[PDB]
Amino acid sequence: TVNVQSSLMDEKLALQPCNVELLESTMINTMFTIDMNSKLKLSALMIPRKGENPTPLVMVSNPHALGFKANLNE
Amino acid sequence: HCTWLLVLNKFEKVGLHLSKDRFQDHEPIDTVAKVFQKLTDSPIDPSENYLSFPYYLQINFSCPGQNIEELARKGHLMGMKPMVQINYMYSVNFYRWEMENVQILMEAAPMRSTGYCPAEAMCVLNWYTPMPFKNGSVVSSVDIYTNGIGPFVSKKRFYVNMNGFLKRDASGKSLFAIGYESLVLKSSHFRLSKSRPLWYTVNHAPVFILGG
Amino acid sequence: KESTIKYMVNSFKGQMAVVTENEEIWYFLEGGYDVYQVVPSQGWETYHNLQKMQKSSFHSEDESLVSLFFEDGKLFQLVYLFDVGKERLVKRLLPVGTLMEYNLPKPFTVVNQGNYQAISFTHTCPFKEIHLIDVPKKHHASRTESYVALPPLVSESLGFHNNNTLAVYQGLVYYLLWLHSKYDKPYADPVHDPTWRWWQHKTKDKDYFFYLFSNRLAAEGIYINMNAYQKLYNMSGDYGIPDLFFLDKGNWFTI
Amino acid sequence: HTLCRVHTVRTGKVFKSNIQLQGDPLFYAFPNTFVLKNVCKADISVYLGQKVFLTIDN
Amino acid sequence: YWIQQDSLDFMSLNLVKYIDVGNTIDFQFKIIPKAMSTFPIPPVSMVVGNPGLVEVKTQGVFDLNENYYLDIHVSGRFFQKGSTSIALVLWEGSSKCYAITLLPTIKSSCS
Amino acid sequence: IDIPRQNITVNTDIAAVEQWMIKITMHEGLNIYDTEGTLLDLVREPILQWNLGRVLTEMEVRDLYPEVNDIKVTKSPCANDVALIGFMMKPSSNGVFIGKTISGFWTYKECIWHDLTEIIYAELKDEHQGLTVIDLVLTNHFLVILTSLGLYVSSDLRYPTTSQIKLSRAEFCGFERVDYIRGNLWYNEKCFANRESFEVDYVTITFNRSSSCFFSKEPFLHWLPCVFSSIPRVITFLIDQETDSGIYLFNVQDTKETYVTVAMLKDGKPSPRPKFPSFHFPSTFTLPLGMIFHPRSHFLYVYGSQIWVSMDGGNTFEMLCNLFSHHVTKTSNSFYTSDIVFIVEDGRILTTKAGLTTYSELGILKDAIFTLYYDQLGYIHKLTPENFDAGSKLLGHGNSGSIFGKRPDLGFEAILVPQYISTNEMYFFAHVPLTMPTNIQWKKRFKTIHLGKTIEFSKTGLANIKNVYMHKTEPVGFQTSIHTEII
Numbered sequence A: 001t002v003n004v005q006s007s008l009m010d011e012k013l014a015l016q017p018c019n020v021e022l023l024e025s026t027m028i029n030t031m032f033t034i035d036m037n038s039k040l041k042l043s044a045l046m047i048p049r050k051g052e053n054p055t056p057l058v059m060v061s062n063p064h065a066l067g068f069k070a071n072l073n074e
Numbered sequence B: 001h002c003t004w005l006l007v008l009n010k011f012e013k014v015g016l017h018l019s020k021d022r023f024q025d026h027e028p029i030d031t032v033a034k035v036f037q038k039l040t041d042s043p044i045d046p047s048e049n050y051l052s053f054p055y056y057l058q059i060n061f062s063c064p065g066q067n068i069e070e071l072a073r074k075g076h077l078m079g080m081k082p083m084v085q086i087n088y089m090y091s092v093n094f095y096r097w098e099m100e101n102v103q104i105l106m107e108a109a110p111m112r113s114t115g116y117c118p119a120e121a122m123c124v125l126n127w128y129t130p131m132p133f134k135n136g137s138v139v140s141s142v143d144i145y146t147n148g149i150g151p152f153v154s155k156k157r158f159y160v161n162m163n164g165f166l167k168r169d170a171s172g173k174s175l176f177a178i179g180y181e182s183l184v185l186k187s188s189h190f191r192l193s194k195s196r197p198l199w200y201t202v203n204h205a206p207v208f209i210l211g212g
Numbered sequence C: 001k002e003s004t005i006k007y008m009v010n011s012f013k014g015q016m017a018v019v020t021e022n023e024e025i026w027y028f029l030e031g032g033y034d035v036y037q038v039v040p041s042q043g044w045e046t047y048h049n050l051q052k053m054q055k056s057s058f059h060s061e062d063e064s065l066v067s068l069f070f071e072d073g074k075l076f077q078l079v080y081l082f083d084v085g086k087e088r089l090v091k092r093l094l095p096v097g098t099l100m101e102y103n104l105p106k107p108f109t110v111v112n113q114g115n116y117q118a119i120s121f122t123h124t125c126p127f128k129e130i131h132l133i134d135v136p137k138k139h140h141a142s143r144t145e146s147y148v149a150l151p152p153l154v155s156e157s158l159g160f161h162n163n164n165t166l167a168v169y170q171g172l173v174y175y176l177l178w179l180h181s182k183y184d185k186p187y188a189d190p191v192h193d194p195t196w197r198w199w200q201h202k203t204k205d206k207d208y209f210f211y212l213f214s215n216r217l218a219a220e221g222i223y224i225n226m227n228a229y230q231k232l233y234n235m236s237g238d239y240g241i242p243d244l245f246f247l248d249k250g251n252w253f254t255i
Numbered sequence D: 001h002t003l004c005r006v007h008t009v010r011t012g013k014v015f016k017s018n019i020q021l022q023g024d025p026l027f028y029a030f031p032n033t034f035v036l037k038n039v040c041k042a043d044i045s046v047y048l049g050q051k052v053f054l055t056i057d058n
Numbered sequence E: 001y002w003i004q005q006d007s008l009d010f011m012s013l014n015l016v017k018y019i020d021v022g023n024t025i026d027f028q029f030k031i032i033p034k035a036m037s038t039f040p041i042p043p044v045s046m047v048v049g050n051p052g053l054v055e056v057k058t059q060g061v062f063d064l065n066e067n068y069y070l071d072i073h074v075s076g077r078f079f080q081k082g083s084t085s086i087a088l089v090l091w092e093g094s095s096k097c098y099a100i101t102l103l104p105t106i107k108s109s110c111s
Numbered sequence F: 001i002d003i004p005r006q007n008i009t010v011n012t013d014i015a016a017v018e019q020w021m022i023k024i025t026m027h028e029g030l031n032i033y034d035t036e037g038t039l040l041d042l043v044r045e046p047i048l049q050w051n052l053g054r055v056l057t058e059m060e061v062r063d064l065y066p067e068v069n070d071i072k073v074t075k076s077p078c079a080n081d082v083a084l085i086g087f088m089m090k091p092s093s094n095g096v097f098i099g100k101t102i103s104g105f106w107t108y109k110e111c112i113w114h115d116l117t118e119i120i121y122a123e124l125k126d127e128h129q130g131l132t133v134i135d136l137v138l139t140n141h142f143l144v145i146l147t148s149l150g151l152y153v154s155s156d157l158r159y160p161t162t163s164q165i166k167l168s169r170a171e172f173c174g175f176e177r178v179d180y181i182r183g184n185l186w187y188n189e190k191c192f193a194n195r196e197s198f199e200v201d202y203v204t205i206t207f208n209r210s211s212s213c214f215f216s217k218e219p220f221l222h223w224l225p226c227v228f229s230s231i232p233r234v235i236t237f238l239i240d241q242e243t244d245s246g247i248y249l250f251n252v253q254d255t256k257e258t259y260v261t262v263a264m265l266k267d268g269k270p271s272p273r274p275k276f277p278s279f280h281f282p283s284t285f286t287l288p289l290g291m292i293f294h295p296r297s298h299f300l301y302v303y304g305s306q307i308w309v310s311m312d313g314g315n316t317f318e319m320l321c322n323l324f325s326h327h328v329t330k331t332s333n334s335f336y337t338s339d340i341v342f343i344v345e346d347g348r349i350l351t352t353k354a355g356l357t358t359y360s361e362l363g364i365l366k367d368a369i370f371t372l373y374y375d376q377l378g379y380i381h382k383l384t385p386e387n388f389d390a391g392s393k394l395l396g397h398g399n400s401g402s403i404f405g406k407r408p409d410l411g412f413e414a415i416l417v418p419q420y421i422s423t424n425e426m427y428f429f430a431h432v433p434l435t436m437p438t439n440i441q442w443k444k445r446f447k448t449i450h451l452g453k454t455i456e457f458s459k460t461g462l463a464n465i466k467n468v469y470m471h472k473t474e475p476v477g478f479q480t481s482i483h484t485e486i487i
C-alpha cells in the first residue's frame, strides 16, 4: 500500500507545498435539478496559504446548457 | 508627541484673557436670555427658560519644536475639531443623591482671540466648550481627543473638579479660605525632604493636599 | 529583609506599588507572588536615557521624588526637577509595562542562521497573544447614561464662532441637562427620551429652518439642529471589558 | 521497505481443505493487467490478467 | 499595507463625488497591515482642502487582527458651490507601496 | 468584441474629457487574471483637432540633436498620454520645435515633430538671433508658450476654425530677448472635465532680473502684476482655488530671509494684509527656487537647496529634506499613484508620495540633458533627445523604480555600535571619530532620510528604523543614533 502523500516528501523529489489551506462545501453530497426557468445557488469556503496567492476558478461540464455567475468575496 | 492643554475660563472673560480661572462658582448664571431673545429664525420657544453655566473649557495643543498658535491655526485649517467627553462621579451620600452616573459628549468650537490681529483672517485661535455640571457630584473627568482629521494628538484625561475652599473678598479676587497664597516653591523645600503618602478617598476626593 | 517599606499605594484594580526609606519603588501584581524592583533597575535606566534622547521636559539628571499615586490604573509620580534656572515640580508617568519590557538581562540562547549564529532571546510568556472577543457593551454593563450636545453651526465663511454663538451653545447644553434632571417626575409622559418634550411641535418645521440657514437668511447665522442635542441609548463605540459590572437577581454575563 | 511495505492476505487455509476448480478459468486477452473497480461499492472489484478474480471484499 | 474598498465605483484611485444641498456621501475603507502596526494610533491620517464648505465625520475601529476600519461621512455646510479634496494618507507605510494616499474630490454642484 | 461608441460616450463635443482606464479580466466577480490599460477619445481632445505646424520629416529631427540644450514637457491635465515636448536650444538654432505624442512616449518613433516658427513670425515684431522656446504649458482649453522673443497664447482649443493653431502674442513692454529668456511659467494642474462655473485656470509668469511677477485668469490676454505697492523678490505666485487665496514665495536679496505669504483673493485680485501671519524659513535656507501644488490636491511643496511640504494652505511647513550646496532643478509628479520625483543637481533623484514626511532616493542618472515624465497609469519615462526610455523591467502596475537598475544603498562610511535595549528593539550609535573635521561631520551621521528604512547586515540581519536621534554631547564619540525594531 503506497501512501503517495508521504512519498511526496523525498528530498530528491523536492516538491512545493500546497498553496491553499482549505476548500470546502456541502455541494459535493447531493445532486441538483434545474427545471425550466429555475436557478440555484451554490456556496464554497476557501482559505489560502499564509503567503501564497491561489486563483480559484469555476467550471461547468456543459457550457451550452448551463450558465454560471461566480462571486468571490472576503 | 503632541499634548492637549485645557484651561478653565469665565463667562465674562471668554476670549479676552487666556489665563486660568479656578472653579469657584457652582451656581448657574442667567446672562443668556438676551441672545436667545435676539434669535428668531430658530426652533426656540420664548416660553422656555434658558440660562448658562459659568466657566468655559479653553483647549489648544502643543507639539515640540513649534509654537502653539501656528499649531492651532494649522489644526483649524486642516479640519480638526476637538471632541470632549465629560464623565461625572456620583457622590458618596447615596441617601441624599442617586447613584446614577452620566456622560456628555461635546465638540469644541473654534474662536479667534480678541486681540489686534495684524493678519486679515486668523490669529491666536482656541477651541471653547461649555463646562456643564449637575447637582450631587463634585468630580468630573474630561477626555479630549481629535475627531480623526488633521494632526494626530493623543487622547488626554484631565480632571475639572469643584474647588470648595475658596472665598471672595471686597476686591472680588478669588483668595483661599484655608490659608495664604503668599509662598513660592524653592529648591530648598524639596532638597532634603523624603517622599510622603498622598491620602484621599479613592474616587470622590476633588481636592488633593500634601503636607510633610 | 534589609529594606523597610515607608508606604504602600494601591490601584484597586490588581496592582500595587511600594516605597521604601531608600526611595526605591517596588511593584506587585495581585495575580502573582512576585515583587519587582522597578525604579532602581536596568529598564528604568534605559527609559530615563531615552527620555534624555527625546529631550523630554519632565526628565532631568537630578530630581527628587515628592510622591506617587494611582490615577485610573496608571502610576503617576510627582517629582521636583532640579534643573538649573527651570527647576519645577511636575507630575510624570511611570509606565511599568515599558520598564518591564526593557529589563534586559534575560534568558537567551545562541541559535544558528545560514552558517551564522545570532542571539535569540528565550520567550517566557506562556502564550503568544491574548485577546478578548464577544465583549459586552461597556455602557450597558456599567449602567451609564450618555448625552450628546454638538455645537450650533455658523454661516460665517471662515467658520469661526462669536461670543454670542458660544452663549447659545452654553444655554442649549444647560437646557439639555435641565431636562435630564426633570425627567425624574413620577408621571410617565407619552414618549420616552425626555428631549422629545423639548422639540415636540418644532420637529415639523425643520426643513423651513434649514432653508433659512442654507441661504444665510436666518437671524444671526446660527443653526440649531434638532438631532444635535439628544440622549443616545445604543451606540457602538469604545469596547473591551468594562471596568464596572452590575448584576441583579440571577442575570449573568460572559467573557 | 521504501515506498510501501509488503504484506500478504491468505485466509481459509488453516486446515487442508481440498476443493478443486470447476470449469475453465477465464483469462484477460491483453498482456497487461488491469483492475476494474465498481464505482459505487468500493469493495467490489475485478482483477483482470492471467486469471480473473472478482472480489466482494477489497 | 493593503487597502481594501469592496464597494463598487469606489475602487478606482481617483474619484469625484457630487453632493447636492442636504445630500451626504458615505464610504468605508479597510487597512490590513502586513506586519507590526502602530496600534495605539490609527494608521491613516486624513486632511481636507477647504473645510469651510464640507463637514466630515470620521469613525475608526480596530479589531482583533489589528485591521483598521474607517467610515467617512461627508456633508455640505450650506447653499454654496465649490470643491474640496479629502486626502487619506498612510503615514507609516513606506514609499514602495503602489497606493499610499487616496484623493477623493467632493464637489458641491449639479452632477 | 465590438462596442458601439454610443455605448460609451454618446456625445461628440470638443471639450476636456478624462481618459478611461481599462481592466481586462477573465471573470469580473471572480477576479483571477487581469490586465491594466487605457482608452482615449480622439474626437473630443482639444489639442488633437488643431494642426501644430510644419511637420519635420525624418533625418531633419536628428539635425536638432547637436543643438538641443534643454527639454520641457506639458502634461495635458485631464487626459494624460497627450504630452508635448519642447526643445530649448542655443542661439545657433533659429526655430521653435515642439513634438507631440498620443501613447505617452511608450514608443519613440510615434512622436510627431512640428516647427511653429512661421506662426510665431506672423505675430512676431521683435526678431533676433534666437527664438527658441523657453517654456510651454498646456491648460484645459488653452496653450501658453513662453518663446524667447515673447509670450504667446493659443486662441481657444474648443472651437476650431482656422484648421491650424493660431497664437496671439500677449504684451508687456521693455522686455528684451534677455528678460524673456530668464522667465518661467507656473500653472496649477487641475482637471476641469465638466467645467463647473467656479472652476478657473490661472497662469503666472516670473522672470528674475516694474515687477517680475505677472499673473492672469482664464483667457490669458490681460496680464496684471501679482504684487502691488529692501524689496522682496517674488519667486513664485500661486492661486489656491480651493481656499481662494494667493500664495507668494518671497526671497529677500542681500539677506537670507525667505518666507511664504498667503493673502485673501479679494475680487479676483490678491489683497494686501496677509490672510494669516507669514511663515519664515530658517536662515539656513540658502536659495529657494520654486513652489508647486501636487496635481488635483492641496499639498504645497517648496524646493531649492531644501524640500519642504505644507499641509493646509501654506500656514506651516515641515522640512523633509536639506541639501547642502545642491539644489533641485526640476520636479515631476502624477495625479495617479501620487508619485513625486525631484531631480537634484548632480543627477540624484529623490522620490516621495504626496503627504508623506519621509522620502527616499531612487538613484543617480548621468545623462547630460534629460527629464522625467509620468503617464496616466503612473509608468515613469526618461525623456532625452533621440531616446524615450520606458524601463528595463516591466511590472503589472506603474511602479516608478522600473527605469533604474536596482535600489541604492542609503548607507554611509561610518562605524556603528549596536546596543540592545529590549528583546525586540535596539540602538545603533554612529561614531564620529574625535579629531574629525567639523566640515566632515555630516559624512558620518544619520539623516532624516533614514526614517522608516530597513537596516540590513551582510552575514544575517534585518531590522526596521523607527526613530532617528541626534545627540552631539550625551555620549562622547557618537553624534547620531537610530532606534530600531528587530525582524
Ligand SMILES: *[C@@H]1O[C@H](CO)[C@@H](O[C@@H]2O[C@H](CO)[C@@H](O[C@@H]3O[C@H](CO[C@@H]4O[C@H](CO)[C@@H](O)[C@H](O[C@@H]5O[C@H](CO)[C@@H](O)[C@H](O)[C@@H]5O)[C@@H]4O)[C@@H](O)[C@H](O[C@@H]4O[C@H](CO)[C@@H](O)[C@H](O)[C@@H]4O[C@@H]4O[C@H](CO)[C@@H](O)[C@H](O)[C@@H]4O)[C@@H]3O)[C@H](O)[C@H]2NC(C)=O)[C@H](O)[C@H]1NC(C)=O
Residues within 6 Å of the ligand: E016, F007, F008, F009, F010, F011, F013, F017, F018, F193, F194
Ligand atoms: C467619465 O467617463 C464617462 C463616460 O461616459 C463620462 O460620462 C459622460 O459625461 C458627459 C458629460 O460631459 C455626459 O453628457 C451629458 O449627456 C446628456 C445626455 O444624457 C442622456 O442620458 C440618457 C440616459 O442616461 C441617454 O439615453 C441619452 O442618450 C442620447 O442622448 C443624445 C443627446 O446627447 C441623443 O442624441 C440620443 O438620441 C440619446 O437620447 C443621453 O445620454 C446631455 O443631455 C447632457 O447635457 C447636454 O449636453 C450636450 C453636450 O454637452 C448638449 O448638446 C445639450 O444641450 C445638453 O447640454 C446642456 O446641459 C446643461 C447641464 O449640463 C443644461 O443646463 C442645458 O439645458 C443643456 O441640457 C450632458 O452633456 C454623458 O451623458 C456621460 N455619459 C454616460 C454614458 O454617462 C464622464 O463625464 C467622465 N467623467 C469625467 C470627469 O471626465
Ligand SMILES: *[C@@H]1O[C@H](CO)[C@@H](O[C@@H]2O[C@H](CO)[C@@H](O[C@@H]3O[C@H](CO)[C@@H](O)[C@H](O)[C@@H]3O)[C@H](O)[C@H]2NC(C)=O)[C@H](O)[C@H]1NC(C)=O
Residues within 6 Å of the ligand: B005, B006, B007, B018, B019, B058, B060, B061, B068, B069, B070, B072, B124, B125, B126
Ligand atoms: C495655549 O494655551 C495655554 C494654556 O491653556 C496658554 O498658556 C498661557 O499663556 C498665558 C499668556 O497670556 C500665560 O499667562 C501668564 O500671564 C501672566 C500675567 O501677564 C504673566 O506674568 C505670565 O508670565 C503668563 O504670561 C499662562 O501662564 C500660560 N499658561 C501655561 C500653562 O502655559 C497659551 O498662551 C495658549 N497659546 C495660544 C497660542 O493660544
Ligand SMILES: *[C@@H]1O[C@H](CO)[C@@H](O[C@@H]2O[C@H](CO)[C@@H](O[C@@H]3O[C@H](CO)[C@@H](O)[C@H](O)[C@@H]3O)[C@H](O)[C@H]2NC(C)=O)[C@H](O)[C@H]1NC(C)=O
Residues within 6 Å of the ligand: B026, B027, B028, B051, B133, B134, B135
Ligand atoms: C441644583 O439644584 C438647584 C435647586 O434644585 C438649582 O438651583 C435653582 O435654580 C432655579 C433656576 O435657576 C432657581 O429658580 C429661580 O428662583 C428664584 C427665586 O424663586 C428666581 O430668582 C428665578 O427667577 C428662578 O425662578 C432656584 O431658585 C434655584 N434654587 C436655589 C436654592 O438656588 C441649581 O441651579 C442646580 N445646580 C446645577 C448645577 O444644575
Ligand SMILES: *[C@@H]1O[C@H](CO)[C@@H](O[C@@H]2O[C@H](CO)[C@@H](O)[C@H](O)[C@H]2NC(C)=O)[C@H](O)[C@H]1NC(C)=O
Residues within 6 Å of the ligand: B035, C163, C164, C167
Ligand atoms: C460679546 O462681546 C461683546 C463686546 O464685543 C459684548 O457686548 C458689550 O456688552 C456690554 C454690556 O455691558 C456693552 O457695554 C458693550 O458696549 C458691548 N460691546 C459692544 C461692542 O457693543 C457682548 O455682551 C458679549 N456677548 C455676551 C453674550 O456677553
Ligand SMILES: *[C@@H]1O[C@H](CO)[C@@H](O)[C@H](O)[C@H]1NC(C)=O
Residues within 6 Å of the ligand: F002, F003, F004, F007
Ligand atoms: C450596446 O448598447 C446597447 C444598448 O444601447 C446594448 O443593447 C448592446 O448590447 C450594447 N453592446 C454590447 C456589445 O454590449
